[PDB]
């Protein structure tokens, strides 16, 4: 269906959805529970980071024309905000500064002409997920490995818990995604910024995502690690992600 | 409005760090870090807060404009951290002092205009000290992305590192590079060599064009925390050297 190439930039900042236990803790999760039995684990909704997504409207086009995403510039925003060791963080030792945010993190983004397609996998299939979230349906023990029944569109912001969903590599013909998971108590967060780096979105045939209904989809999860309060309680900390996407007009048939 | 390349000049400079400078004898250091303040009552001492270093270099008057083509940069005095005999708390009984370690941030920028920055706060309710320039009328939205917090890095020792990042939605006429590494025990890793160069040309082959015949350099080099015998912790910073090659570029008007 895709014919000869026939330019625009779109910019976006996508805010994180870490749980937001109250206005003053926006960008944080609720304090983490621990040691629940697999058989009775009802996490509070505000405990669970979710994927961020947004649908950016493009100029109405019109042998039909479609917006083709060619490159993306993206970075995590506010990385330096973690140099505040004076407020809220538990002291590393007596008379010492506050504990830096550290621990398990996940850094992910996607650009596509359709909602990001996701596959469900659970640590614990018996986890009772909270009303308001969208999690694998009628899960079984097979849900703790690969169960092909758990397919979803990332079609709602602050809804799909990061812990239940991954990008589906068996789909996403019209999306490019990139993600890194680093797990552990003491993982140092490592984040780079530069306005000189670009990611090409073209495939092996030189075709970028083609925007269905003049709509561009951006998706992200940026869990930076755990924040430890004076009490010893722990909260996820997230940061927003910036996207700048270069598109061109592409001819397609019918 | 850029034409063909027209000839060449170097500018060499160093930016000394602004880590807080709690007293003269602690130049390159912050005041000891406080901890466990509530988000409701957090008034950091100005000398506790590292700030971005910046300066505006005047260029020959020379239409033509100065185009920055390459930069050589390194952090200066990296070996000074091999002093474990003074001030540092002993790692254990009879042992040497604790090396500087922990969260660090290494950043520099070259541009034909002041570096453009975006505000983001750990805690929007933080009461920032008089003398510093921080996000104005911050809200809970300031703990994620609030597009109201735009600033020019237009003053040395003024913009706290903790409140500002380079704004990737702007800086059309600046190149910036930064790495943040967070954690209690992060080892600082610094490389020096006079063989490395960074090209400043964009996808169209155009470097920063110096407006008002002015080159802007910016940097933050927080190397990590220094732990005193007492157990108190201070930021340690180092200066950054720049060598920038510029050429004459023709432009319309």
């Amino acid at each position, epitope marked *: 269906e895709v014919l000869e190439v026939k330019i625009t930039e779109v910019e976006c900042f996508l*805010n994180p*959805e870490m749980g*937001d*236990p*109250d*206005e003053n803790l*926006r960008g944080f999760s609720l304090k983490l*529970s621990a040691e629940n039995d697999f058989s*009775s684990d*009802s*996490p*509070e*909704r*505000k*405990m669970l980071p979710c994927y961020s997504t947004a649908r950016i409207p493009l100029p109405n086009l019109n042998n039909l024309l479609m917006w083709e995403a060619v490159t993306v510039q993206t970075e995590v925003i506010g990385i330096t905000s973690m140099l505040n060791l004076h407020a809220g963080s538990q002291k590393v030792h007596e008379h010492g500064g506050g504990k830096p945010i550290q621990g398990s993190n996940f850094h992910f983004f996607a650009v596509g002409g359709d909602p990001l397609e996701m596959q469900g996998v659970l640590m614990n299939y018996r986890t*009772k997920y*909270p*009303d*308001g979230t969208i999690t694998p349906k009628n899960p079984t023990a097979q849900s703790q490995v690969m169960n092909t029944d758990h397919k979803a569109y990332l079609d709602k*912001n*602050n809804a799909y818990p990061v812990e239940c969903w991954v990008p589906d590599p068996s789909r996403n013909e019209n999306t490019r995604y990139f993600g890194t998971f680093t797990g552990g108590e003491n993982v140092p967060p490592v984040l780079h910024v530069t306005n000189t780096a670009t990611t090409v979105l073209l495939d092996e045939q030189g075709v970028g995502p083609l925007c269905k209904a003049d709509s561009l989809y951006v998706s992200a999860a940026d869990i930076c690690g755990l924040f430890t309060n004076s009490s010893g309680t722990q909260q996820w900390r997230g940061l927003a992600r910036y996207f700048k996407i270069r598109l061109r007009k592409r001819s397609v048939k019918n | 409005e850029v034409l063909e390349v027209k000839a060449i000049t170097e500018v060499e400079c160093f930016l000394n760090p602004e880590m807080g400078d709690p007293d003269e004898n602690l130049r390159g250091f912050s005041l000891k870090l406080s901890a466990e303040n509530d988000f409701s009552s957090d008034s950091p001492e100005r000398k506790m807060l590292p700030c971005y270093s910046t300066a505006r270099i005047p260029l020959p008057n020379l239409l033509l404009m100065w185009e920055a083509v390459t930069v050589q940069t390194e952090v200066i005095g990296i070996t000074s951290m091999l002093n474990l005999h003074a001030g540092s708390q002993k790692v254990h009984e009879h042992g040497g002092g604790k090396p500087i370690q922990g969260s660090n941030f290494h950043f520099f920028a070259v541009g034909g205009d002041p570096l453009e920055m975006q505000g983001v706060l750990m805690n929007y309710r933080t009461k920032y000290p008089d003398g510093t320039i921080t996000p104005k009328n911050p*809200t*809970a939205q300031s703990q994620v992305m609030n597009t109201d917090h735009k600033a020019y890095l237009d003053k040395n020792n003024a913009y706290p590192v903790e409140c500002w990042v380079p704004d990737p939605s702007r800086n059309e006429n600046t190149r910036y590079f930064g790495t943040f590494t967070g954690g209690e025990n992060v080892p600082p890793v610094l490389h020096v060599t006079n063989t490395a160069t960074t090209v400043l040309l964009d996808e169209q082959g155009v470097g920063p064009l110096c407006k008002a015949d002015s080159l802007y350099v910016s940097a933050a080099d927080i190397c990590g925390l220094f732990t005193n015998s007492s157990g108190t912790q201070q930021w340690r910073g180092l200066a950054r050297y720049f060598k920038i090659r510029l050429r004459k570029r023709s432009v319309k008007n």
Partner: single-chain antibody
Amino acid sequence: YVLTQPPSVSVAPGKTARITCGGNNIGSRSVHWYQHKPGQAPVMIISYDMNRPSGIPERVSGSNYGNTATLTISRVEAGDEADYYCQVWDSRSDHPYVFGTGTRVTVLGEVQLVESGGGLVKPGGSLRLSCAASGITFQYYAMNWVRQAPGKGLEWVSSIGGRGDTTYYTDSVKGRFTISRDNSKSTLYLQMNSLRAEDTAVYYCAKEPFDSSGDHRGVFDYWGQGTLVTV
């Protein structure tokens, strides 16, 4: 959807109180619990089956399985004497917020929400209630009206999204009551027209948790003291 609670429970100090909440497959739904003392704002004590809000003691615990959710209060004190309500939320339903019938528990021995506009009114007449919210950015909060008629339980009346763009009414008031919102003034409104005697109640203003879109979450995490409307 129907939530069944035993009307009353009696407990000695130091003993354990157990309050059940019956529902068809309630184990598949997130149950929240509220403590309500006479002439006081209801307090949320359990969210999503077993989560305690900040300030609620470890003695208070929640359980939810099959057809029964259970509120357990251990080492019972005089201060525990109150009404207790379970509550669920079904986004995809005609009546999306449902309270239990309530349980009277007898022991043997910042943000503000301020309601106004309550008073006395002729049957068939009109009255507009206000809620002045303080210390929150109002467009980030789904807001609700919940009433208690004399000798009856908490009844959910109306809900509105943070944007003002999503409105829900109980059938009882549909066509007569209008929920509205002025985010610039941080004020919630309930326009009550065609008033009936069955509308005699204390009207409580109920905040939902902060949401980046001000969506409905199904949780009443903070309440005002109420305003009396008598017809």
